Every structure is written in structure tokens, then in C-alpha cells.
Design a protein around this ligand. Structure first.
Ligand SMILES: Nc1ncnc2c1ncn2[C@@H]1O[C@H](CSCC[C@H](N)C(=O)O)[C@@H](O)[C@H]1O
Ligand SMILES: [Mg+2]
Length: 306
């Protein structure tokens, strides 16, 4: 019911998308919403009021791309608008599991926090693994000569492309595929907002895919990373008695043997019902002395207070 809508940015001229992006930038996230802001916050709107804001071409572009649907008397949108860090982003509305389509796209739960954690440097070539709405890809595109975003969710790939087009971004490409498979060559920069939470080792769905997706990611990251390259991962970690996450991580990465420096910043923590520990934190691979370090950083709390 939510997250299966058809998204078709190829059905609309790039200039028309950029223009809609321009209008969105004026109103999405700001007080006293116009019909376009209303549309993109889930409120059905009168088509004629919309026309005056985006033009009859804009109206058609909204329809052709899947951004709006004609309920006869009113238009409504399956998507919701965000504006943040210089970028306008459409994604699915935040709703509960029971009403989520299998292709439901991350409604930007942690996006804004993660952007603020990311190192400020830019560079040659960036990869955004599991790109979702494309939000992180869009932000990286300002700093990096080109950006590739990858997702196994084909609808996320469409959404990302639409979002790139709305912002008039030229240097960002998206590909459908499984993990690193459609990502050819090596990268200066790799970001992974990983689909892990409380599911332990078990695949539940594309937003809670289990620890094996992290294993696949980190085993393959050495061969995908330019020397001196940076990796940033948002993830959940499960420590089991006699079996801490970091030693599995060390084995996956071939840490000593590939000469990587890794830092795990742990933000949240709770005892598990087996004497182990669940953690949430932020993992950084960056140039420097080979080895693994764990540091405390309660950035969730700090983000909440400021
Ligand atoms: N095997 C796989 N290969 C590529 N992407 C995958 C994948 N399994 C899950 N994903 C994707 O990983 C994403 C995690 S949510 C993060 C989305 C976006 N980067 C953001 O920060 O908002 C989801 O979009 C999910 O579809
Ligand atoms: Mg789920």
C-alpha cells in the first residue's frame, strides 16, 4: 500500500524537472505552504492553484514523473518533500511496517544526522552504497567530481535519479544492483547507511537486511577503495559473549593484511537478553596507522540537544 508507486523521471525533460526543483526549493520545508508544498506534504490540492505555481507544463511534469496523481477533482502525491543541506529530496512518507511495500524507500530517518557526521573533505570519485532516495549522493555531488549511488531496490534507483534531476545535478549517476556488483572501479569515498537495526543476523527486508550485508560490504571494500580513501558507515553491531563485532569486522576487512585504519564511534548501547550487547554507531575507514579503535561518541544525544 505505501512504497510501490511508479516513479518515472525518464518520462520528463531534464529542464522541466530542474524547474520543479526550483519551485520546490522555494517552498518545501518553509512556513505558510503553497499548493506545491501542500502537495508534497501529503495534502490533496486543487490542480488550478498548482498550475499557477508550476505552470501547465509543471503540472504535466508532476503527473508524467509519478510525483502527482490525478484523483479527478484534486491532485495528491505518494511522495513527501524534504529540504536540507542545499538539496531538495523526495521520498516515501514515514509510516509503519505493516503498510510498507517491499520497495518502500527510507523516509530519511537518519539522513540529516549522518550528513553532519560525514567528513567535510571532497575529492575525485564517491560511492553511496544503498543510496535510497539518493540524499547522501546528492550532498556528495557538491564535493566530488562524480558520484555513483547504488541500490538493489529499483524504485529507489528511480527516486534517486528523479531527485538528482530535481536539483539539476549533472555529476551523479545511479545503478540498480546487488552491493558492489554494478560499481565498477575503485572510489575515493564510500558511504553506507546500512540497513541494520535489531534483526541480528537475519534478513527481514531491504531496510533490515541482517549482519551478512555488513560482512559482504566489508569483505569487498578493500578491493573497491582507492589508497588513502575514506569509508563511512552507519550501522548496528551485536556483541555476543566470546564473540565481539569488532573481531568479525577485523576478519572481514583483512585489516592487517590490507593495511587499513578503522575507527568505531559507538553512540548507543543496550544489554542483550543473552549477556551480549547491541550497539549503534558510526564506523570510519580513513588513512593512517593500521589498526582498529573504538571510541565513545554519544552523537545521538548531542544531535537531540542541538
Ligand atoms: N544488497 C543490497 N545492495 C544494494 N543496496 C541494498 C541492498 N540491500 C539493501 N540495500 C539498500 O540499502 C539502503 C539502506 S537505507 C539508506 C538509504 C539512503 N542512503 C539514506 O541515507 O537515506 C536501502 O535503500 C536498501 O534498499
Ligand atoms: Mg522493515
Amino acid at each position: 500500500i505505501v512504497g510501490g508507486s511508479t516513479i518515472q523521471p525518464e518520462r520528463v525533460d531534464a529542464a522541466a524537472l530542474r524547474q520543479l526543483g526550483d519551485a520546490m526549493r522555494k517552498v518545501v520545508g518553509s512556513a505558510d505552504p503553497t499548493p506545491l508544498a501542500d502537495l508534497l506534504s501529503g495534502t490533496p490540492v486543487d490542480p488550478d492553484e498548482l498550475t499557477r505555481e508550476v505552470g501547465a507544463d509543471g503540472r504535466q511534469a508532476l503527473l508524467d514523473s509519478g510525483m502527482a496523481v490525478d484523483d479527478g477533482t484534486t491532485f495528491s502525491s505518494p511522495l513527501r518533500g524534504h529540504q536540507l543541506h542545499g538539496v531538495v529530496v523526495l521520498s516515501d512518507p514515514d509510516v509503519e511496517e505493516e503498510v510498507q511495500h517491499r520497495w518502500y524507500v527510507d523516509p530519511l530517518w537518519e539522513a540529516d544526522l549522518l550528513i553532519r557526521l560525514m567528513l567535510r573533505r571532497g575529492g575525485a570519485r564517491a560511492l553511496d552504497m544503498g543510496c535510497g532516495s539518493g540524499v547522501l549522493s546528492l550532498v556528495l555531488a557538491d564535493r566530488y567530481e562524480s558520484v555513483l549511488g547504488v541500490d538493489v531496490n529499483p524504485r529507489a534507483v528511480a527516486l534517486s535519479r528523479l531527485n538528482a534531476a530535481l536539483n539539476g545535478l549533472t555529476n551523479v549517476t545511479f545503478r540498480e544492483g546487488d552491493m558492489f556488483e554494478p560499481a565498477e572501479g575503485r572510489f575515493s569515498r564510500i558511504v553506507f547507511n546500512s540497513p541494520t537495526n535489531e534483526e541480528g543476523n537475519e534478513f527481514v527486508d531491504l531496510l533490515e537486511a541482517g549482519e551478512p550485508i555488513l560482512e559482504t560490504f566489508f569483505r569487498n571494500v578493500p578491493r573497491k577503495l582507492e589508497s588513502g580513501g575514506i569509508v563511512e558507515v552507519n550501522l548496528a553491531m551485536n556483541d555476543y559473549p566470546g564473540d565481539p563485532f569488532r573481531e568479525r569486522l577485523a576478519d572481514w576487512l583483512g585489516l592487517t593484511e590490507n593495511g587499513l585504519r578503522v575507527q568505531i564511534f559507538t553512540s548507543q548501547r543496550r544489554a542483550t537478553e543473552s549477556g551480549g550487547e547491541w550497539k549503534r554507531g558510526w564506523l570510519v575507514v580513513a588513512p593512517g596507522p593500521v589498526g582498529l579503535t573504538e571510541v565513545e561518541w554519544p552523537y545521538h544525544d548531542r544531535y537531540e540537544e542541538d
